[PDB]
Amino acid sequence: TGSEAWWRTKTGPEWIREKDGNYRVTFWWRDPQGNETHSPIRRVWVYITGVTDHHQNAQPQTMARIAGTDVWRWSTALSANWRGSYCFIPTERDDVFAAFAPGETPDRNVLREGWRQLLPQAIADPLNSQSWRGGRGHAVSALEMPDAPLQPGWDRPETPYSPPLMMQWHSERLGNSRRVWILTTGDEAPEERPLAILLDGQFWAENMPVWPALASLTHQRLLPGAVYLLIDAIDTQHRSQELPCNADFWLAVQQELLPQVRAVTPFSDDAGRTVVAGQSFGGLSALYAGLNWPTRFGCVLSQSGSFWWPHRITPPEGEVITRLKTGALCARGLRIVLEAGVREPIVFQANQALYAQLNTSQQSIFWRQVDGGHDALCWRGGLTQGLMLLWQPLIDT
Template identity: 65%
Template sequence: MSATGSDAWWASKKGPEWVAAASGTYRVTFWWRDPAGTQATSRVQRVWLYITGVTDHHRQASPHSLQRIADTDVWFAEVELESRWRGSYCLIPSENETDFPPDAFASPPDRIALREGWRKLLAHAIADPLNPQSWRGGRGHPVSALEMPGAPPQPGWGASETPFNEPHCLTWHSARLKNRRRVWVFTTGEGVSADRPLAILLDGQFWANSMPVWPALASLTTQGQLPAAVYLLIDVIDNTHRSQELPCNEAFWLAVQEELLEQVRAIAPFSDSGENTVVAGQSFGGLSALYAGLHWPQRFGCVLSQSGSYWWPHRGEGQDGFLIEQLKKGALQPHGLRIVLEAGVREPLIYRTNQALLALLEHKPVTIEWRPVDGGHDALCWRGGLTAGLITLWHSLSRTA
């Protein structure tokens, strides 16, 4: 047996390892190799473990650090996860003994202290060097993927080698919004039929660059689980524009309808039918998708909302979010919308407000499917929900229907 911390021992490590626990959960061990060696030669005092929805501020749990095995370059931590859990994580080596204010270690920990501590630390996060499944997450820092054996399937995402049509990348100059941004137009299937349905994916830069969605969509189309379609991915420009344009912004959606759709149609014809037009988004994008469907159901008849920020604009203030308030007042009367509503059980505020929204929509003349997910505010969960949601909303159009 190789000595702990030897080159041969490290060669056997391929990322987190887990064993089944008697409770039906899994005990997961995370490893990190200190490039500076042992405690005698390294200045590293902490290796913070940030697991979305488990050790982050959403959980309101004290910050979690790996521990060094004395006189080795080995750091490790054990965490218990549910059998259906899926999510991303990152490591944050630090030369400080404590990077959080004392309130972060109170009982219970102060959520603001946790949020601020993690916000500063995440700028120094690294992906797990032992895990080849890594990317740059939606918040801009590197993350790695982890899923337990019981995690639900993610349609299309195992087909990374599937050939696909090259997407068109355009620049949209908006007169109404007085800005410009990239958009991507992607088509699946053969031919250029004007009967193809349209799907608009918000936060398009993520699905185009950080976690390219093209092979998954192409594979599912080839399999007949999705129809031949046109996909429009819209860049957010930057976080400032994202926070202004996505939360319930009429001007943004008027610009999409009056300016962008005709520009896209000239490249890739699609159906005018709102009945099969999908708007899909996550977080602020999920809020925006439902806003579009509620206000222009004749154009955007299908909504795929994942981890929608329905608390907006009252984060943690105990007040109804804007859309929930409007629905309660009767200011919005949706008719005929088809909605897939998804939220993670490990994102408490968002999960709670999604349930409040669901309770209102269930009494409206809409078709709605509710999907709770054992995960957090996490793109690794969203990618499977995105393709599964498209399959649900376009079921009547696919070859397997």
């Protein structure tokens, strides 16, 4: 153990199927500065989305080294259907988090604060080649248990016949400029092609490119030839101001953006196959769009929707949840995919309350629970599955 030949057998996290059906998963990190006497490393935090972070109010988990070697280790239990991102934070610092007694639920606010000081130092798993830029400012790695559901398109990525195009969208309504990406996956009946709008376009166009997965599903006849519009959120300041129920954003998209997009490639005016898909504030904004302009956006795809907005500390209460409760807004004729993970309690509970509220006979709602959390590795699969659900009627032809 801890030898050169021993490290050769390690390809990343290892798992063992237990009696109950869950897995004992072990993580390994090789200290490049040697053993105790040589390496000045104090901590090696294991930050797994929805498992060891603030979403589970978990006490900060750090690895421990096997005395005498440069091997750090840490294990945990994970469900069979789970999938999620993770990263390690090897540091010399030991003055960030406070002490925690066994069985003490820490304050979530205190956790995020503590993590905001360490995450910039976070790194992907050097043993795992399935890594990418997380979008939050650090690299991450992918882990999937054997029964994680298939992620349509991402399993058989195929090159798109048409390359993605980029356009600079200058908004008079918003008073700012921004990038938008356009992908088309079919030329037949161009005016019948459904339009699908994806928020946080920068991520789905650069950090985790959605084109190969979309083209693959189209080639398999599991998605119709469509027109995909990815919109850049720009940055945190703008995104936090434009996505959480901001009417100008959607007014601007309809009056300024869609006509420009329509000038380059045709798409259907039928709200019934017009999708607005987003995650987190993007999910909230997509439903908000469908709720306020159902004549233009009839299909909503909300993944981990921030329906706890504006106040996170209070999950069941939400702005969109209040409008539906009184009667100002109503999902009539809308097809809605509402996804949320069990590893994001606040968000999950918020989505349940939202579901109960709008669940009437006058609309088609698809509830999807995910064994995972506030994680783009999971969302990527729900994104493609969600489009299949929202477009199920067309796809059947």
